[PDB]
Amino acid sequence: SIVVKNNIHWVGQRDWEVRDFHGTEYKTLRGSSYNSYLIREEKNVLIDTVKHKFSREFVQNLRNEIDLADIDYIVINHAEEDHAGALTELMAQIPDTPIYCTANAIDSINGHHHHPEWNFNVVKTGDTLDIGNGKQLIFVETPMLHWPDSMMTYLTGDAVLFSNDAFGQHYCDEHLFNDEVDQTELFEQCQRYYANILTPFSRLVTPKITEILGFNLPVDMIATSHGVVWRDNPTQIVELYLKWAADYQEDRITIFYDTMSNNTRMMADAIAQGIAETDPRVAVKIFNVARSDKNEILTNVFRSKGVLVGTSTMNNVMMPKIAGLVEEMTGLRFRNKRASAFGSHGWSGGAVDRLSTRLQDAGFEMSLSLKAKWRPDQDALKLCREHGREIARQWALAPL
Amino acid sequence: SIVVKNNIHWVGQRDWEVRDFHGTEYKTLRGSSYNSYLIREEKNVLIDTVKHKFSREFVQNLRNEIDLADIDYIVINHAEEDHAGALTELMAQIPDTPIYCTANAIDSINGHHHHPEWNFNVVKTGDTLDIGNGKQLIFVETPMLHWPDSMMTYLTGDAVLFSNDAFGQHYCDEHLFNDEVDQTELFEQCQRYYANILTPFSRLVTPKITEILGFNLPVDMIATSHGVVWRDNPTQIVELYLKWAADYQEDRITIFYDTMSNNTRMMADAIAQGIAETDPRVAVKIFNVARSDKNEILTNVFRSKGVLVGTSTMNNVMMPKIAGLVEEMTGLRFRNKRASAFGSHGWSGGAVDRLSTRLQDAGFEMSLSLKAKWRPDQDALKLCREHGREIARQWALAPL
Numbered sequence: 001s002i003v004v005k006n007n008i009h010w011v012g013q014r015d016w017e018v019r020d021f022h023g024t025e026y027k028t029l030r031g032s033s034y035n036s037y038l039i040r041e042e043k044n045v046l047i048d049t050v051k052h053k054f055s056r057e058f059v060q061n062l063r064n065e066i067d068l069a070d071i072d073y074i075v076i077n078h079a080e081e082d083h084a085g086a087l088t089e090l091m092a093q094i095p096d097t098p099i100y101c102t103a104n105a106i107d108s109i110n111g112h113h114h115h116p117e118w119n120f121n122v123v124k125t126g127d128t129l130d131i132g133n134g135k136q137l138i139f140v141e142t143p144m145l146h147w148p149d150s151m152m153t154y155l156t157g158d159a160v161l162f163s164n165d166a167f168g169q170h171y172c173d174e175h176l177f178n179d180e181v182d183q184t185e186l187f188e189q190c191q192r193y194y195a196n197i198l199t200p201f202s203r204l205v206t207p208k209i210t211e212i213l214g215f216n217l218p219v220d221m222i223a224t225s226h227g228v229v230w231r232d233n234p235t236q237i238v239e240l241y242l243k244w245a246a247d248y249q250e251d252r253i254t255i256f257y258d259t260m261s262n263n264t265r266m267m268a269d270a271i272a273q274g275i276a277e278t279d280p281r282v283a284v285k286i287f288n289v290a291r292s293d294k295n296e297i298l299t300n301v302f303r304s305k306g307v308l309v310g311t312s313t314m315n316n317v318m319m320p321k322i323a324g325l326v327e328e329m330t331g332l333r334f335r336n337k338r339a340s341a342f343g344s345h346g347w348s349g350g351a352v353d354r355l356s357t358r359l360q361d362a363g364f365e366m367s368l369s370l371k372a373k374w375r376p377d378q379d380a381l382k383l384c385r386e387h388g389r390e391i392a393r394q395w396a397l398a399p400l
Numbered sequence: 401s402i403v404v405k406n407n408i409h410w411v412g413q414r415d416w417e418v419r420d421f422h423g424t425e426y427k428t429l430r431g432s433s434y435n436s437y438l439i440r441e442e443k444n445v446l447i448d449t450v451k452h453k454f455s456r457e458f459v460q461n462l463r464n465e466i467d468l469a470d471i472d473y474i475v476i477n478h479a480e481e482d483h484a485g486a487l488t489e490l491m492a493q494i495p496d497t498p499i500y501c502t503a504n505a506i507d508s509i510n511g512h513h514h515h516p517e518w519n520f521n522v523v524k525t526g527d528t529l530d531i532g533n534g535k536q537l538i539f540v541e542t543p544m545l546h547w548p549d550s551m552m553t554y555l556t557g558d559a560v561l562f563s564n565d566a567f568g569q570h571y572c573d574e575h576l577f578n579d580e581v582d583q584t585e586l587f588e589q590c591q592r593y594y595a596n597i598l599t600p601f602s603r604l605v606t607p608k609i610t611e612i613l614g615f616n617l618p619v620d621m622i623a624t625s626h627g628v629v630w631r632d633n634p635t636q637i638v639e640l641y642l643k644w645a646a647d648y649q650e651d652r653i654t655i656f657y658d659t660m661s662n663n664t665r666m667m668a669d670a671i672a673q674g675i676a677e678t679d680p681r682v683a684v685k686i687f688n689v690a691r692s693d694k695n696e697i698l699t700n701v702f703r704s705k706g707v708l709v710g711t712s713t714m715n716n717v718m719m720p721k722i723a724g725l726v727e728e729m730t731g732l733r734f735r736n737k738r739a740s741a742f743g744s745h746g747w748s749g750g751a752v753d754r755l756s757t758r759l760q761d762a763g764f765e766m767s768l769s770l771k772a773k774w775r776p777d778q779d780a781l782k783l784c785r786e787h788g789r790e791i792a793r794q795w796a797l798a799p800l
């Protein structure tokens with residue numbers, strides 16, 4: 001275990017090997033960590049657990065820290081398996097220990113563990129739990145950030161906000177604190193997490209943070225459930241969340257596509273050229289979805305003012321990876337972004353219009369599509385290059 | 401080169417390494433081959449070429465066989481890049497050589513190569529080309545089998561049908577003939593090809609084969625553009641195509657899904673149990689789409705009387721790989737098949753109904769969906785098992 005601050009002990013688990021979260025929907029290229037915390041004042045409090053995979057290690061390590069019977073309260077901020085996964089193993093040893101959680105957390109904890117006989121204590125925003133020595137926990141409900149059961153726990157005096165998933169990132173390191181790790185790697189993982197997970201709830205992020213800030217509670221540290229503890233200028237991640245939540249976009253355009261014989265790829269490259277030679281301010285990224293990291297594409301889409309999506313026509317429909325990615329984007333609800341569909345066809349086509357419509361359903365403000373037959377010759381590539389020019393002009397953040 | 405029969409020489413290319421066709425839409429787990437044929441009678445005829453990747457090898461090997469100038473006619477059955485890919489390199493050496501192809505082939509050849517100055521000779525079904533020694537080529541248009549440009553070429557006397565893609569398979573072997581290779585491996589690759597490529601055109605397969613058979617032309621060999629030459633009971637693959645085209649289905653049910661935390665997986669296994677303990681005649685296959693070969697899933701769907709597709713709810717929509725696979729199936733147009741959607745959810749759900757509707761759009765006759773909240777307990781697993789029982793009864797090919 002590691003001392004976070006005073007009597008706050010980190011008793012979590014580092015995961016250097018993990019590469020997949022939520023099936024394979026989230027790729028963790030730098031592993032992850034599952035942060036659990038043990039607070040030892042007059043009362044002993046355990047905050048969250050770890051992934052079920054490491055329940056054996058977690059309980060044993062916890063034993064080496066404290067007799068399990070001396071644990072007074074258990075706090076569950078969020079009942080997703082990577083945080084509440086070792087709960088069944090733990091409660092088997094100390095079944096009478098009270099669990100403090102939201103009303104929705106009873107549903108989700110029971111939904112995974114099927115032990116409704118556990119002693120649940122429903123908490124609501126403003127509710128407190130005294131732990132002695134002039135210190136208390138303050139609970140803050142954060143529903144749909146990102147689950148119905150989600151909440152945060154604040155420790156007075158030490159001024160530590162246990163924010164669970166919020167402000168966290170999948171970044172495994174032997175060092176605990178934000179000032180002890182690589183800043184570029186930390187930021188990349190932070191933005192990757194928000195873009196792929198929190199984007200659809202951005203309208204909820206601002207008001208909740210505003211509400212939390214309105215409590216006028218001091219914040220020395222933010223101890224999340226993933227990655228580093230924020231101790232040096234800890235509210236920097238809070239400020240990033242405020243920027244990211246405000247329908248964030250940079251002067252950037254992301255192009256991605258799938259292709260069966262590279263014709264649509266040729267179109268994508270030509271479009272990009274047209275953009276770059278029209279507006280030098282725009283950052284351009286191109287991805288073949290069949291050969292790229294899906295989460296990296298989505299992080300870029302998050303950072304972009306607009307996107308161009310390409311597909312050829314395959315059996316009168318679009319290529320499946322594009323349909324899949326478009327489905328997922330429809331769930332992420334990107335806001336204030338523009339889009340244009342493009343791609344090649346052999347005879348009757350139809351996939352480009354099909355894609356243009358689904359992008360619109362996904363919430364993008366649609367510009368005209370770009371189409372070509374078979375492999376683009378020099379004349380066709382000119383038209384693609386001109387399309388990029390028209391897009392760059394239409395989507396310009398400022399004149400010229 | 402290899403002697404196919406008499407003066408027919410195989411001058412193609414084996415591809416032991418290839419693993420992806422049409423982007424990554426078709427996985428070639430046993431590599432492939434690109435069959436090109438040189439007929440040397442009074443006239444010298446080249447039938448098809450090979451993938452562009454091997455154009456250098458192809459032209460050189462062809463040189464070792466014959467002076468390129470002594471080639472009288474070039475036949476292009478199909479202008480997809482894996483057969484017409486080396487055409488530009490070849491025609492650079494012998495630009496005056498006539499190319500015999502369908503009207504649609506002019507569009508597709510020019511569409512890829514951009515050399516419309518080439519000497520094209522449009523052919524239609526019944527058209528002939530004398531090559532001397534009492535032998536002639538007979539052309540047969542096969543539009544949308546599987547491209548608009550597709551055709552077959554028949555050689556009289558030797559009685560060889562050059563069928564291009566049709567009756568072919570992606571199966572690389574040093575041996576040329578069907579009786580010289582592993583029969584189980586050959587069949588598997590043959591069925592994989594039809595299921596993933598030809599399924600949507602099945603209504604066209606029967607009439608065209610009936611038309612071709614009506615010509616009363618003898619068939620000693622079927623020389624396709626992929627894999628083996630059929631010489632021993634060659635029409636066996638023709639008969640298989642007739643069976644496969646007739647909305648083929650076995651007493652088989654395929655279950656596939658994606659899952660973020662395995663709840664839908666638990667549902668799938670329980671459903672399968674219910675089926676197996678209700679109808680022992682049914683063959684059951686289960687696939688996690690995130691961890692499985694997509695083409696294997698589709699081959700099974702092709703062989704199945706019905707399917708069950710599972711998804712959890714992810715940001716109010718379905719998981720992307722399921723949406724992608726469903727999109728692709730909508731293009732393949734499976735016929736006379738039944739389907740049922742299932743999966744888990746956390747709160748409001750909606751993905752299971754969303755999937756049920758899209759399966760219906762894909763052409764499946766829909767049975768009721770199966771839903772569960774979070775992880776299924778023993779009672780929930782019973783309901784899943786009962787769902788399998790109800791499906792088995794509904795989809796029974798015969799009583800009991």
Ligand SMILES: Cc1cc2nc3c(=O)[nH]c(=O)nc-3n(C[C@H](O)[C@H](O)[C@H](O)COP(=O)(O)O)c2cc1C
Pocket residue numbers: 258259260261262263264265311312313314315316317344345346347348349350373374375422
């Ligand atoms: C398996 C397959 C299915 C196709 N289906 C259609 C179709 O339904 N309609 C059409 O116009 N072209 C169809 N085509 C032709 C392609 O769309 C055409 O080759 C296109 O230029 C390829 O674009 P890409 O190289 O970017 O994948 C199909 C091609 C293949 C290989």
Ligand SMILES: Cc1cc2nc3c(=O)[nH]c(=O)nc-3n(C[C@H](O)[C@H](O)[C@H](O)COP(=O)(O)O)c2cc1C
Pocket residue numbers: 022658659660661662663664665711712713714715716717744745746747748749750773774775
């Ligand atoms: C990223 C994510 C998004 C989710 N979105 C929804 C949702 O929109 N509606 C809902 O009812 N449940 C939602 N859930 C809850 C899951 O559907 C629930 O955990 C389900 O039981 C998981 O099924 P599975 O393990 O087969 O993937 C979401 C879960 C995750 C991890």
Ligand SMILES: [Fe+3]
Pocket residue numbers: 078080146165
């Ligand atoms: Fe979570």
Ligand SMILES: [Fe+3]
Pocket residue numbers: 080082083165225226
């Ligand atoms: Fe988490």
Ligand SMILES: [Fe+3]
Pocket residue numbers: 478480546565
């Ligand atoms: Fe083809």
Ligand SMILES: [Fe+3]
Pocket residue numbers: 480482483565625626
């Ligand atoms: Fe082919």
Ligand SMILES: [O]
Pocket residue numbers: 080082083165
């Ligand atoms: O999580």
Ligand SMILES: [O]
Pocket residue numbers: 480482483565
């Ligand atoms: O092909």
